[PDB]
Enzyme design. Sequence first.
Site, PDB file in Angstrom:
ATOM      1  N   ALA A   1       2.792   8.440  -4.557  1.00  0.00           N
ATOM      2  CA  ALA A   1       2.093   8.266  -3.292  1.00  0.00           C
ATOM      3  C   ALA A   1       2.783   7.200  -2.453  1.00  0.00           C
ATOM      4  O   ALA A   1       3.288   6.204  -2.976  1.00  0.00           O
ATOM      5  CB  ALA A   1       0.633   7.890  -3.538  1.00  0.00           C
TER       6      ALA A   1
ATOM      7  N   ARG B   1       1.943   4.826  -0.716  1.00  0.00           N
ATOM      8  CA  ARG B   1       1.501   3.443  -0.785  1.00  0.00           C
ATOM      9  C   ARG B   1       1.990   2.732  -2.038  1.00  0.00           C
ATOM     10  O   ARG B   1       1.699   1.544  -2.208  1.00  0.00           O
ATOM     11  CB  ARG B   1      -0.026   3.373  -0.707  1.00  0.00           C
ATOM     12  CG  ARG B   1      -0.738   3.994  -1.886  1.00  0.00           C
ATOM     13  CD  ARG B   1      -2.211   4.185  -1.604  1.00  0.00           C
ATOM     14  NE  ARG B   1      -2.782   5.261  -2.406  1.00  0.00           N
ATOM     15  CZ  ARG B   1      -2.663   6.551  -2.124  1.00  0.00           C
ATOM     16  NH1 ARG B   1      -2.008   6.969  -1.054  1.00  0.00           N
ATOM     17  NH2 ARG B   1      -3.218   7.446  -2.937  1.00  0.00           N
ATOM     18  N   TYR B   2       2.709   3.423  -2.918  1.00  0.00           N
ATOM     19  CA  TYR B   2       3.265   2.815  -4.118  1.00  0.00           C
ATOM     20  C   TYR B   2       4.776   2.662  -4.086  1.00  0.00           C
ATOM     21  O   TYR B   2       5.303   1.783  -4.765  1.00  0.00           O
ATOM     22  CB  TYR B   2       2.893   3.637  -5.359  1.00  0.00           C
ATOM     23  CG  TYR B   2       1.425   3.963  -5.495  1.00  0.00           C
ATOM     24  CD1 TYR B   2       0.453   3.026  -5.194  1.00  0.00           C
ATOM     25  CD2 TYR B   2       1.014   5.210  -5.941  1.00  0.00           C
ATOM     26  CE1 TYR B   2      -0.887   3.324  -5.324  1.00  0.00           C
ATOM     27  CE2 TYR B   2      -0.319   5.516  -6.074  1.00  0.00           C
ATOM     28  CZ  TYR B   2      -1.267   4.571  -5.765  1.00  0.00           C
ATOM     29  OH  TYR B   2      -2.603   4.871  -5.895  1.00  0.00           O
ATOM     30  N   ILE B   3       5.485   3.488  -3.322  1.00  0.00           N
ATOM     31  CA  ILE B   3       6.940   3.539  -3.371  1.00  0.00           C
ATOM     32  C   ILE B   3       7.527   2.809  -2.175  1.00  0.00           C
ATOM     33  O   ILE B   3       6.966   2.807  -1.078  1.00  0.00           O
ATOM     34  CB  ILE B   3       7.434   4.997  -3.438  1.00  0.00           C
ATOM     35  CG1 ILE B   3       6.864   5.813  -2.284  1.00  0.00           C
ATOM     36  CG2 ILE B   3       7.032   5.624  -4.743  1.00  0.00           C
ATOM     37  CD1 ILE B   3       7.294   7.255  -2.301  1.00  0.00           C
TER      38      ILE B   3
END
Lengths: 442, 442, 273, 273
Positions: free
Chosen positions: A114, A116-118
């Site tokens: 997602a 918002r993580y990478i």
Amino acid sequence: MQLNNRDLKSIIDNEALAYAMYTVENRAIPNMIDGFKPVQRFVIARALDLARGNKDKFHKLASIAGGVADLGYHHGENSAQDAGALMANTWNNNFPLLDGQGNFGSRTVQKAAASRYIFARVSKNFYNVYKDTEYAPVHQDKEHIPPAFYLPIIPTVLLNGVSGIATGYATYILPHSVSSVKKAVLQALQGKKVTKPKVEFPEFRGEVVEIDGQYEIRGTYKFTSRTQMHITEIPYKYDRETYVSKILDPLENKGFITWDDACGEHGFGFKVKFRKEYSLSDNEEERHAKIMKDFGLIERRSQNITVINEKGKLQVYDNVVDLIKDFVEVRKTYVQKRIDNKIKETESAFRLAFAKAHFIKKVISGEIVVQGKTRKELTEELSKIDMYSSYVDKLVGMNIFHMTSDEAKKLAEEAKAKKEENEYWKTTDVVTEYTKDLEEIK
Amino acid sequence: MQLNNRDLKSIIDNEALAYAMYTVENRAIPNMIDGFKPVQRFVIARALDLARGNKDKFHKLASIAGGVADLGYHHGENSAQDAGALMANTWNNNFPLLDGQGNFGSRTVQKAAASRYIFARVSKNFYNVYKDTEYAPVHQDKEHIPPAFYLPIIPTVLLNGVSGIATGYATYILPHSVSSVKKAVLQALQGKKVTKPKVEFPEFRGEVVEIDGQYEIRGTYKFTSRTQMHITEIPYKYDRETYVSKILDPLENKGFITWDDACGEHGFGFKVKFRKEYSLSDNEEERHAKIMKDFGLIERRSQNITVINEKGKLQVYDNVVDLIKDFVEVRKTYVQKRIDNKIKETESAFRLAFAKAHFIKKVISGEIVVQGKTRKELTEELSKIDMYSSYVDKLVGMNIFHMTSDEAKKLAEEAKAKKEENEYWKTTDVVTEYTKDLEEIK
Amino acid sequence: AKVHKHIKANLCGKDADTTLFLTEGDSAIGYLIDVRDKELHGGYPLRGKVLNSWGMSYADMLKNKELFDICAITGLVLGEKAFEEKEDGEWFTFELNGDTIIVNENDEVQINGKWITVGELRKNLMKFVKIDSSSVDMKKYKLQNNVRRSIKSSSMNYANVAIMTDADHDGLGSIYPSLLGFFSNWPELFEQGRIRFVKTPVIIAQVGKKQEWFYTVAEYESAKDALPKHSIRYIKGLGSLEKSEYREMIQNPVYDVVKLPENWKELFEMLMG
Amino acid sequence: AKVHKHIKANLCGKDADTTLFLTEGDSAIGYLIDVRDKELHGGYPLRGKVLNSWGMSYADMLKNKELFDICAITGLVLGEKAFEEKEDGEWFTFELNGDTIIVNENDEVQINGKWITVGELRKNLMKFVKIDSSSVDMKKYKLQNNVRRSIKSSSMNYANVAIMTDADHDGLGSIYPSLLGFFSNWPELFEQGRIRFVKTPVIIAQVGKKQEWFYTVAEYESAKDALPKHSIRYIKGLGSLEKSEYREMIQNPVYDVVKLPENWKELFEMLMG
């Protein structure tokens, strides 16, 4: 109260031709020079001014995708997220223009984590190739901050491979190796016969060949025993889920094999067991053909090279050699532009540096007395001299330590080096400076 | 590998204290000190972030709301868009901290335009009131770039008026006038008897009276004729649509009047025509009572002042005067922090400016000879002096025009000015420095 | 039947230990494929929120796709005891790493990450102390994670279940307790030590060549001082670890082995119930 | 019946001209209420995309709430002519502002924004040139915006409709053509010069105290050089004009008076058809 008579034809011609402009401003076809679709260009511009401060700092992909609306992108933040995730990984790109940290997928599973993580950042590849970003054409639309197209040293469109579907047009370009493209461009710059660059798919351990103008991507397998086989590689377009579901699952349902998974860090891998119901021909070539047919290690792909040239117009190239030739001819003009403005900058720098050297020499020896005076009087008395004409603000804006002998010698040497650089820029042509810049890419 | 014994009780314990922590960062109850709900603080911090370059530039509301997520907000950009739209306008806010351009609504219609059309910027109100932001408490959560709370001079929670509902807790505060709040805060600063602040709704031309501790909000009406009356104002919480649909339309269907629209640029207004069905008594007081009863020009609102103190703990107040008395006590400490840090900064600046001025006094006559030396030799040769050693790097890296006589007197006068500023800050306390800053609000 | 998203360990259902991972999302399990031991590291991605299974009727437990797939991959039949404990009447006590451990003659003891039978350990000439059955502390014995309780036969093909979920709110009010609510249908697993959770680091340091892992903020704040030139990477999710860090986290895991207290009848109703 | 969001003009249905506005969004009427003439400036907010009206029957027109509300507000009944033309047998020509105008004795002529009867104008002693009916240029007569075609009686209460929308893609592929298609049920409305469009400037300058309005980007480019210290403001939507700019755009407006040609019955098939 002004009344016009615009009728319905004009209003229907403006209600249309604005949708056409809107779809033109974001089209899936890649530009010929920098190889960017509009969304990728906006993502790159966003990552660049996000990386203006700290070059090595990773940025959350959500910020990169969300900043594109300020730049001028109209199709939201989902498209920017997908483009960034597809541009940051190394399993999809031979020449990654964005460096990634996080889960950006792999050949086995092609879905990134997602957004918002990478995290993603502009890689050393971009800064190594994409030069003269300042000299890129300014877009017609004042709203679009990013330039019309960036200026790579080599035709990046040929490197990572670009695919798209457009209204009435379709593009598809196979990934060429960086070495082959660089060699071909070096040949085209010197006017030689350009060797057709060899396609080399990133992170691909198989075999690639050309048949009747169709590229056949061969996978590799090995027989360990009579009834068991170890698939070592498969064509590029499969991941684990789609390959298993579209080959082995129906074939398991039929009952021909009983496959086993062995895919690990070294890309793909599958250990296969052959049942009695399946028939294997004794002849090696016939059996090999049967395997490559049923197990799907043979794929054929054709190139539809349709790209936007430097004039914003669609152009279809029969072969990549013409693309390389046209790109070299276009980039020569921008190299000449760089030569011209570089000559200007070094000329100005030489005059200003000579002025500083003369100021320091006169101050230290006996000539200019700043030891008690008025600033306006000093400026007017050092400005009546013809040499210090338009540099009085910079010339008087020198620092205290410049008066010391060491920095005096340093600035004299700097002026001499600026003269040498000016002479070198004046005495070079496009070929030499393009060749020199075509030597740092790796 | 390591195996723990976390059990299931701690599983559900950590499932809470995290959802609870999730709601705590999103309590709708306004912070006492700054009056900002958590969403509003992020919008203000983002608008300040976008306004470093040009303070008067108008940025899109979509741009403002899209940057709060990077600052630490977790609830999407819709909440930030709505908070900005409610902040920028003037009809809803006695003291609006965001200056808006576009359609931010009015009393008649309270809906603002789309966030991508309307621009917003931090108004001069914010900069006149919201001081000492650099001194604000740093958040416990390191992911929260916006501070724990901002530091407005006066209790903005009473300036704009706040309403909010939480899990088991509710707040409702009436918008008190700016001048009365400033007077009450000044009386609290001097320790005198604090007046109950006067509530004055923004863009309200009607009447407000406090009865039994409840504020009765009354509209104003004038009889144009025997059967025609011209309402001049209506209670605050009515906008034209809901007012009409909830009072005028049902009773018009009930058939006692034939009202008409008279709303203009001067707020509200409705010319009414009385039918024969409606009954009007000859008594002025009884007619007044029945008019303000059926037509709903009267309304009762009760304050439930729940605020979040400087310790982040939820608090309830009987009356606003206690809120002001606590606010001034909390703000006095931060003004003291400003006082102390100002003492330190002024002392350091005075020493640096004095040394820089003394460099000129030594250079001009006969003492310091920069005219021919080595840079490190000069730094060592002047660093032996105690007054020169501390700031040598800045002291030497100093421009050429500084040895002129005019700049010599300028540096001397600047050093003397810094000394006077220092002894001024040393001879001031919280009361004087807060009363002086409590004189620019208008 | 076969499950498409069933990256499966080779030693599945072959009387050997497995560590089936339930990793959220098909994306963050991309590392698992390249990081697995290829023998005992099965996996199953899950995207979404599993429906509450507490008070939830068994009719649509299998109609629900994910829950039925989980019982398919693990090999469990709802409403039947997962395990089969073998009877015994002997008990021992011994010290392990300075901690007194209460074991049975038919129990399994894990030493250095490998489970060894008590009968085989008794042949290793290390001290065992025999105690009466009435003197055994049941609470301590059931709370020992290095002890397995008298396994005869298992119908599951995967020995363990390790849960892998995000660290931010996408996992807090999400799969993390719902999966335990589902797994509670066989209470023997939790008390046996089967259900576990892989502790994702939340803050990672970058000192020198190697790196430090801080599972929650309190340890990071406490050990920040001893960190020379340290860097912060907030791991608020599984898709924030690079390949090598996920490799270290999988091959050298840390388990929050959950267990059921006598009140587990209640905390599943107080929340999510 | 009474419509809620029908901020209405006082002289509605009183044989006087009105300028009922049809503005997108309930927010943009916030300005209109405060800027109306309070005599002839009715309004009706409409949010969204009006359905394609060229493939469905007249009977189910009223099923849509917004379309029925427009019908009730403006007073037109579907299937009947919006006006009743008065017959004529005279024709005259004259010159106005350097342009030849073809008029009829029973027509209406607008001078400085006020419509005056031709009979009254003939009494003002200005040169009228009589011509035969067979020599009247029908196309030129129908393309005149200062001539009204002999209205006798009208059941229609809001004399004019001033469509007003956004300029960005929410204005291009938007309500504007759908409202035009709906109004196309009444050919006489357009030729009468009634259905209109208010031109919101795209770029507004900020020179001196006043401003300069540029209805096209090309005009802004062409007149940019003559702009002293101008500031640029892209109005890409209605909710981007301050109250004063809206007041100027309302009281001193520029109308895109839409006329339908003989080819209208095809363009509505090629677009949105």
